[PDB]
């Protein structure tokens, strides 16, 4: 969209940074900065993930929950695809994803492939979806469902 494209283009430009420059931007990250690309072939999602899950971030971008793992790390890299009761239109077709579909996450240094292994509906107060189990490498997408009343959760495990 507007800010989305910008965040997206600014991040892609950093692929041409050197390694210390990349590492330096790792530290220094601020809410609203691009941190990864996300591609989900099954539903035509090809965009960027911003840091943070505040209302301000989520108005323009898919956002990374602050205290969750980063892509490829032990724990559960968690992303928010709604702002209050409104899904980012980028996830309008998330209900088409199935167990076994792939989610590709590209940081400045690596391509991580996650495979969906759990889909479920829960409440807005179910904070456990953001839990960090450091014995595994997983990711989570949180959007809304049921006229904004419930949360639609997609979880995926790192495969490559």
Numbering used by the authors: 28 to 187
Give the exact sentences the study uses for this entry.
Recombinant C. perfringens sortase crystallized in space group P21 with two molecules in the crystallographic asymmetric unit. The final maps derived from the X-ray data showed clear density for 160 residues (28–187), only lacking the first five residues along with the N-terminal hexahistidine tag and thrombin cleavage site. Alignment of the two monomers revealed a r.m.s.d. value of less than 0.53 Å, with a slight conformational difference of the turn within the α1–α2 helix–turn–helix structure. Each monomer displayed the typical eight β-strands that form a β-barrel structure. Previous studies have demonstrated that the presence of both histidine and arginine are necessary for efficient catalysis by the conserved cysteine residue. These key residues are also present on the surface of C. perfringens sortase, with the catalytic cysteine located within the β7 strand at position 171. The most notable difference is the presence of N-terminal α-helices in C. perfringens SrtD which are absent in the B. anthracis SrtD structure. While the environment of the catalytic cleft in CpSrtD is equally rich in hydrophobic residues for substrate binding, it is relatively narrow owing to the position of a small helix within the β6–β7 loop when compared with SaSrtA. Overall, the C. perfringens sortase D reported in this study is structurally and catalytically distinct from the previously reported class D enzyme isolated from B. anthracis, suggesting that CpSrtD may represent a new subclass of the sortase D family.
